[PDB]
Design a protein around this ligand. Structure first.
Ligand SMILES: CC(=O)NCCNC(=O)CCNC(=O)[C@H](O)C(C)(C)COP(=O)(O)OP(=O)(O)OC[C@H]1O[C@@H](n2cnc3c(N)ncnc32)[C@H](O)[C@@H]1OP(=O)(O)O
Ligand SMILES: CC(=O)NCCNC(=O)CCNC(=O)[C@H](O)C(C)(C)COP(=O)(O)OP(=O)(O)OC[C@H]1O[C@@H](n2cnc3c(N)ncnc32)[C@H](O)[C@@H]1OP(=O)(O)O
Ligand SMILES: CN[C@@H]1[C@@H](O)[C@@H](O[C@@H]2[C@@H](O)[C@H](O[C@H]3O[C@H]([C@@H](C)NC)CC[C@H]3N)[C@@H](N)C[C@H]2N)OC[C@]1(C)O
Lengths: 143, 143
């Protein structure tokens, strides 16, 4: 079932994020668990857990366009053996439900162009890459 | 010079954002001044002003990857008569300075693909759309 993570669940969330990065051959910094414990307790952010096999990490930030925040689904992951059985759909549905309790004006998600399965999933569940007739790109600088 | 906006500057910020959205024929929400006054008073966002002719609006949000926030340059605009003279460069250099005071681990920016001149500007100043050989895309749902 989906539930909202408590501070004491930080270790499970961190493990799943580590698994996600390992799946993508990306090294992870130390301290994921300690940071997730802090974020879950104190910040305008939440984590949803599907048992111990999937999670969603959402941040809520201010926007002049809305009375409520703009939400970002910063991380969404289901463990590979549990995919294609509706877990990601359930997590994303619960994301929409939870951000609606905050009157969020919009949900954003960053995705690599090459991740066509994720893109297909998001496009089939109501998200779009198009604004004013153009694709939207994410630019970053790591610091 | 460039300055960090105060609550008293909400009117000038709101005017500039209205002008930006009018130029690009994108919608303008009601209540921009009052919302900016609220946003500027809080700890997780700031606006930089170049006189009354340009602005940067930055939000800060938590990440498990860093002790500091992830910053997002949600809006960057210079009035048309003042472009191509280095104002945008100065604003972006002050964005990096200010987010360094917060120990931000990354800067992110949403950029329409069609905005080729803005994209050249960001690439010239150290931002990248590429991660592991793939372009990064933004997906949204308005709510
Ligand atoms: C090539 C490439 O890109 N590789 C990427 C490899 N790794 C990653 O990207 C890592 C991160 N990604 C993830 O962790 C996971 O991918 C995700 C992104 C979180 C997804 O989480 P789940 O797999 O749990 O999601 P789901 O099961 O809820 O839905 C997924 C698909 O299941 C089928 N389905 C489910 N329910 C039903 C139903 N009731 N009726 C009919 N069909 C159904 C349907 O076909 C659907 O596909 P469609 O997208 O709607 O067309
Ligand atoms: C978060 C967010 O909202 N992101 C979107 C960015 N916002 C916009 O697109 C709104 C409209 N544009 C501006 O608001 C401002 O123009 C910018 C984008 C902040 C830059 O400010 P400046 O004009 O002050 O720049 P600059 O003088 O420091 O450096 C000069 C270099 O700017 C580029 N440049 C000049 N003129 C335009 C132009 N009309 N359109 C697009 N690019 C332009 C060009 O690349 C030039 O380079 P080149 O010489 O032609 O090679
Ligand atoms: C409806 N969603 C948008 C979101 O995608 C996001 O839009 C960005 C927004 O942060 C920012 O938009 C500005 O730049 C846009 C222009 C330069 N391209 C048309 C015009 C609208 C103007 N507000 C640009 N960085 C790119 C634009 N797609 O932020 C505002 C929003 C209302 O939440």
């Amino acid at each position: 079932e989906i539930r909202v993570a408590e501070v004491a669940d930080a270790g499970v969330v961190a493990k799943l994020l580590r698994d996600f990065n390992t799946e993508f051959d990306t090294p992870v910094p130390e301290g994921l668990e300690e940071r997730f414990a802090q974020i879950i307790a104190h910040d305008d952010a939440f984590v949803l857990l599907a048992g111990d096999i999937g999670f969603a990490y959402v941040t809520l930030r201010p926007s002049p366009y809305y009375d409520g925040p703009v939400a970002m689904l910063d991380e969404l992951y289901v463990a590979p053996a549990h995919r294609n059985r509706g877990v990601g759909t359930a997590l994303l549905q619960r994301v929409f439900e939870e951000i609606r309790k905050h009157s969020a004006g919009e949900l954003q998600i960053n995705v690599d162009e090459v991740d066509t399965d994720a893109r297909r999933f998001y496009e089939r569940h109501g998200l779009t890459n198009i604004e004013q007739g153009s694709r939207m790109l994410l630019y970053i600088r790591e610091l």
